Design an enzyme around this catalytic site. Structure first.
Site, PDB file in Angstrom:
ATOM      1  N   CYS A 170      57.874 -97.980  29.200  1.00 53.12           N
ATOM      2  CA  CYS A 170      58.824 -97.155  29.720  1.00 53.12           C
ATOM      3  C   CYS A 170      58.503 -96.412  31.063  1.00 53.12           C
ATOM      4  O   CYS A 170      59.506 -95.842  31.585  1.00 53.12           O
ATOM      5  CB  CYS A 170      58.831 -96.066  28.450  1.00 53.12           C
ATOM      6  N   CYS A 188      60.745 -93.529  30.655  1.00 55.38           N
ATOM      7  CA  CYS A 188      59.921 -92.072  30.563  1.00 55.38           C
ATOM      8  C   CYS A 188      59.468 -91.810  31.860  1.00 55.38           C
ATOM      9  O   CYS A 188      59.282 -92.797  32.801  1.00 55.38           O
ATOM     10  CB  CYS A 188      59.155 -92.191  29.446  1.00 55.38           C
TER      11      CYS A 188
END
Ligand SMILES: *[C@H]1O[C@H](COP(=O)(O)OP(=O)(O)OC[C@H]2O[C@@H](n3cnc4c(N)ncnc43)[C@H](O)[C@@H]2O)[C@@H](O)[C@@H]1F
Length: 252
Positions: free
Chosen positions: A75, A157
């Site tokens: 991520c 992320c």
């Protein structure tokens, strides 16, 4: 014939074989996807658009395919792009520093392809498919990318990077798919920063394009989502790729 049903290019030739072969190849290279049954993938991909009106495609149509193509990507190593896919790909290919949507099974399957079907026949339309502007937005190709894009952006992320084409009239185009879908699907709970790399199209000595009004707009949107914004100019994409390949051993 001398006039097609729709205004856009028709399904890419040999679409079914092409997708199935891409799936086989992807699942051979990537152990995380070794198991995936490619015939099931093709059936779900087909199921989304075959026998459906190609101006009435929905994200739900793609849900069976989405389920089958479920996949973890690191991520914190996501590279988004707007109108500059080729350099994004050239970059990640060096040593897999980051992952673009075309590094996932579903992105790899659909990259550069066009497809559509017909309401009430189960034939693939090889003659024409809807154009997003002239015909309809809810077409098989556009709906696919929106649905898959949204899920990819939702998974990001930490620091998310985006390459932008600094040669374009609007370096960040709020109305592009990047601006309208990806930007708004980053999760502020997860994403610390969006860092834009503005790729200069212009030879030699150019402006600080991180000062461009459209970059300030992107910064404003992002910042108002409680995500930090950073920007870097890439003045010479050729020198950049050279430095990525041969890191600082050289004039990097
Ligand atoms: C989410 O956004 C980026 C593409 O962002 P752009 O700003 O480049 O999008 P735009 O020019 O407005 O539209 C391009 C459309 O092309 C389709 N599409 C996306 N990705 C591909 C690939 N790999 N091959 C062919 N077509 C593609 C979509 O229909 C876009 O709407 C993408 O990473 C995600 F789509």
């Amino acid at each position: 014939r001398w006039r097609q049903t729709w205004s856009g290019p028709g399904t890419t030739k040999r679409f079914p074989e092409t997708v199935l072969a891409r799936c086989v190849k992807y699942t051979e290279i990537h152990p995380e996807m070794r198991h995936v049954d490619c015939q099931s993938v093709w059936d779900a991909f087909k199921g989304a658009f075959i026998s459906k009106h190609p101006c009435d495609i929905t994200e739900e149509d793609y849900q069976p395919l989405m389920k089958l193509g479920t996949q973890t990507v690191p991520c914190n190593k996501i590279l988004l792009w707007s109108r500059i896919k080729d350099l994004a790909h050239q970059f990640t290919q060096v040593q897999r520093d980051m992952f673009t949507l075309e590094d996932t099974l579903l992105g790899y399957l659909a990259d550069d392809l066009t497809w559509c079907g017909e309401f009430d026949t189960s034939k693939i339309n090889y003659q024409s498919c809807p154009d997003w502007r002239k015909d309809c937005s809810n077409n098989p190709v556009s709906v696919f990318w929106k649905t898959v894009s949204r899920r990819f952006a939702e998974a990001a992320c930490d620091v998310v990077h985006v390459m932008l084409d600094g040669s374009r009239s609007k370096i960040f185009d709020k109305d592009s798919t990047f601006g309208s879908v990806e930007v708004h699907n980053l999760q502020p709970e997860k994403v610390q920063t969006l860092e834009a790399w503005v790729i200069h199209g212009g030879r030699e000595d150019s402006r600080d394009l991180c000062q461009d009004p459209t970059i300030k707009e992107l910064e404003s949107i992002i910042s108002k989502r409680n995500i930090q914004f950073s920007c870097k100019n890439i003045y010479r994409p050729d020198k950049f790729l050279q430095c990525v390949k041969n890191p600082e051993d050289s004039s990097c």
